[PDB]
Amino acid sequence: AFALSKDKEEEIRKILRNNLQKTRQRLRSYNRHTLVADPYEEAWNQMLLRRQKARQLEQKINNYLT
Amino acid sequence: LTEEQIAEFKEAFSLFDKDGDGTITTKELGTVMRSLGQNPTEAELQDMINEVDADGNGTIDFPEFLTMMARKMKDTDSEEEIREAFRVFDKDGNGYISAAELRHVMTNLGEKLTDEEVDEMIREADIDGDGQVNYEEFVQMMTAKA
Numbered sequence: 349a350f351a352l353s354k355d356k357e358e359e360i361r362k363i364l365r366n367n368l369q370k371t372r373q374r375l376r377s378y379n380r381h382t383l384v385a386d387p388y389e390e391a392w393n394q395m396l397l398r399r400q401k402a403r404q405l406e407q408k409i410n411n412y413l414t
Numbered sequence: 415l416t417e418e419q420i421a422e423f424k425e426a427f428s429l430f431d432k433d434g435d436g437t438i439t440t441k442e443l444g445t446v447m448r449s450l451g452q453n454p455t456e457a458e459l460q461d462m463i464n465e466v467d468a469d470g471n472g473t474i475d476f477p478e479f480l481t482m483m484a485r486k487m488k489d490t491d492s493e494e495e496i497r498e499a500f501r502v503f504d505k506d507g508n509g510y511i512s513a514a515e516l517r518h519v520m521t522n523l524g525e526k527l528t529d530e531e532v533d534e535m536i537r538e539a540d541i542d543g544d545g546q547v548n549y550e551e552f553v554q555m556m557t558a559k560a
């Protein structure tokens with residue numbers, strides 16, 4: 349005698365989909381504002397930093413007396 | 415990639431592979447993270463390896479390291495591309511894409527829309543219910559693999 353009509357089903361779909369979308373929004377924000385460092389990003393940044401620092405030193409010399 | 419580009423990867427990789435054996439172990443991953451103030455459990459570090467360990471032999475070799483780095487770069491570039499698109503679509507710059515603005519986007523992309531279609535597009539993408547599409551909402555509409 350009682351089931352959810354297709355209309356009812358669609359209502360449920362919206363609420364849960366909306367729940368999911370807020371979840372995805374929270375996960376993206378946990379991710380940019382977390383304090384737990386990604387070791388891959390960190391290693392790559394440590395590698396990028398040391399490389400720029402070594403290119404800048406060669407550059408100061410190359411510009412030294414011009 | 416180019417030769418300098420592969421060099422950057424090798425070096426990034428070497429930060430992990432101290433023993434030079436050409437793979438990175440759970441022990442080595444644990445070590446790198448210990449130098450970051452975190453204390454991962456052996457069951458934890460195993461899952462991290464797991465996330466990158468394509469062939470499933472327990473360690474991360476260099477080609478596997480590549481694939482997952484290229485994928486982190488692709489995600490970075492995608493966020494950048496999504497921000498640029500939002501900026502173009504949000505013509506008045508108020509930080510919200512409106513019906514009128516979406517209609518214009520869609521017309522520019524070759525589609526012929528009714529108002530009921532525009533409203534249903536906005537409504538399905540609309541998370542906070544304000545009837546317009548903000549940046550976070552646009553991100554989910556652009557990254558839907560569904």
Ligand SMILES: [Ca+2]
Nearest residue numbers: 435437438439
């Ligand atoms: Ca090793």
Ligand SMILES: [Ca+2]
Nearest residue numbers: 471473474475
């Ligand atoms: Ca492997």
Ligand SMILES: [Ca+2]
Nearest residue numbers: 504506508510
């Ligand atoms: Ca706008």
Ligand SMILES: [Ca+2]
Nearest residue numbers: 540541544546
């Ligand atoms: Ca909205």
